[model samples]
Target: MSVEIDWDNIRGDLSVNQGVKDFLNSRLQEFELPSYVNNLKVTNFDLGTMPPNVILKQMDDPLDEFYSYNTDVQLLVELDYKGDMSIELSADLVQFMILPVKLRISDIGMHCLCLLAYLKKQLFISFLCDVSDPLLENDKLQVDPSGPNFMGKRALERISLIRNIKIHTEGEGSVLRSVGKLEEFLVDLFRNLIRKEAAWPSWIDLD
Candidate 1:
């Protein structure tokens, strides 16, 4: 009698997916959202292969076994900015144009690049969230009746710059790699979006 493992039919462990989800959400709690944004939550998380093809792979003893695939991450967040609506205006006029506006953003789909490997029983994972051009929805803003209509739309244009970012972090060990590094990435990216400084449109000149 002979025993063999079907490498082609193998899929990433579902329990692993659940663990990753819980781990990430826990890390999210460590983040203190800026004054302009709050209620940040992970709305959806998808990890591993999408059926038909098993991305899991195993090689010779020296090479070991590993998994590599892209993850789909989505988040729901609230933004309340009590500041100037004109994003490009100089600081001299910022105080004069301050406006209070609230917005709810969801379905912010992100493409997360991930890799998992286990060698000599030591686990290592690398992650990369391609923040560039993430899919966005629900840019509507809630404001007082007397508020300017263009304010909401104008703010939406600026907030959409969330796409103009990228977060990459990789390290050894369990907590540091999965929790610490991941949290670091999330906080950095979120701060960039809400603070509205790193996302500033720096380009100039006309065609």
Candidate 2:
């Protein structure tokens, strides 16, 4: 029997890592939110790569023609530690912008999703494969779930290995402090993706 989460009691506990805790506290101060933001309920999250086939299928509909030439990308912001993020919109909503800092700290899972979204972009993909293939070939990032896994009996069931691409940031404390600028980053990223498509005149001739 699965236990239903009492969202009212949910609290953002970044104490899991001292570095992360400090980072959260510092950002909360910088953002000028009360310390109570950490106790807010995280109502959303997910892992696992978004299958290209799924994306293609969803965007192929005639009703979605407006989004056809546009990037078929989706943004899943996991609101909490668990995979409780909402998948309804792809950063096109205003509510995501208003999300509080405590909700942000509870968003470690969403960070992974953001990274995956960034990786899927054509420019970043080529940059990874072309310029830094050797580095990724040597050291691969691994996702490991310890035994007594919360999802079930899956030991090393899924693996994501990207070759040659590395993301490095020069900042103190938590990387998420940088994530505050993610909206701007994504806007620029999508712009680049679209510009690249424009270079190929025949690209939009899809039937």
Candidate 3:
């Protein structure tokens, strides 16, 4: 879904159509690997074909006093990144960052241009991808049948979405620990991305 803008109505006389389009298309927001994993480098970070979508909703309850203050906002954006992973192949982590942002806009009048409030926010980055390696295929002993892995041979393993995997020596334990660290790095990256400084543009409406 696209948001149609009447530039003439919104801002009269000045032609900003081409400028706005160029701004959105030209920029490629990138994320650098954290100190924990400086070995990896991000090559490409681009917004996918589908535009970011947002929906605002509210509750209708007579008993609730703060109903007018509370609003639930949902944001879904498709994004992908190509990185030079030190461990193995140059893989693409294609995912959607679905943020369920709860807001209270009623508190904004006191502070002009202070748009909204985030009551509680959390990151839900999801993707379905299989990271395969020749070494994994060769080592049948290293494969765990009960583990959350795909393919009959365990040669191809789905990148685990679970961020927490506190593991131990040898086994898939070590591998799982590495996966956990990587996920943690991404979590921190996304957290930074969601903040106002990163998300908001200096040239935009926030005068």
Candidate 4:
């Protein structure tokens, strides 16, 4: 018999700068985890049939919408894939604005593209553009060919960029269990991103 898991029961939180709350809330609403367990028995949740690529794509759409906002906000995405998959996010100082924002696939790779829209708008308008593909090596996915071209030149008079961003993972059963680790990582990332001189926890590291 297989074990059942309740995705929503997993609890985590992201304490971020007050500046990005609206953007974070908007993004968090898009995530929906497939129910994996019902009545103490394994239900129809099938990870084998649905490849990670498909799951990643579906999860990323809402992330894109959250980033598409034409406002100033900073965002951080924290995720855990263990007994269940869950994501926690936060933002700082969201406000309304109007501007033409376009995300280029080649500029940041596909998987890395997940939550970049918000970062591009709130953190920095222009990045190095020459970083490795954002997709994880084991994700078995490729960038959409028909996606936007990366060669387009971008000119910007001003840009916002987070001086620091961090992603951390912890093994199961440790004091920092999956849920605990996710929350701590998010809290630390937000603290560092906003506090400039603030020191992060020893367990957390930059992504």
| Best-performing candidate as measured by TM-score | 1
- How would you encode candidate 4's per-residue C-alpha lDDT over 92-202 as one tens digit per residue? 211142222111111111112212223332332112111132322332233332235322233121122232233333223343233343344344434333222211111
Return whichever of 2 and 3 wins on TM-score: 3
The TM-scores, one per candidate, come to: 0.27, 0.17, 0.26, 0.20
Instruction: Supply the global lDDT for candidate 2.
Output: 0.24
Pairs of colliding residues, candidate 3: none
Decreasing lDDT order of the candidates: 1, 3, 4, 2
Stretch of 10 with least lDDT, candidate 1: 85-94
lDDT per residue (tens digit) for residues 1-207 in model 3: 433334335343223333332332233145555433332323322222232222222222111111234333322222222211111112222123221111110110010011122223311121211123244445542322123332234323323222222211113434445455655554454333323222222111111
Report the number of the highest-lDDT candidate: 1
What lDDT does the true structure give each of the candidates? 0.31, 0.24, 0.27, 0.25
- Tens digits of per-residue lDDT for model 1 on 98-156? 32222222223333222333444433333212223232233353222223451244433
Q: Which ranges of candidate 2 are over 4 A from the true structure?
A: 1-176, 199-202
Residue pairs with backbone atoms closer than 3 Å in model 2 (clashes)? 44-79, 44-84, 44-85, 45-78, 45-84, 45-85, 132-164, 136-164
Off by over 4 Å in 4: 1-19, 33-164, 167-178, 184-207
| Model 1 stretches with alpha carbons more than 4 Å out | 1-12, 48-115, 119-123, 127-207
Better of 1 and 2 by TM-score: 1
Off by over 4 Å in 3: 5-36, 53-173, 201-207
Ranking by TM-score: 1, 3, 4, 2
Better of 1 and 3 by TM-score: 1
Candidate 1, residue 49: how far the Cα is off, in Å: 6.2
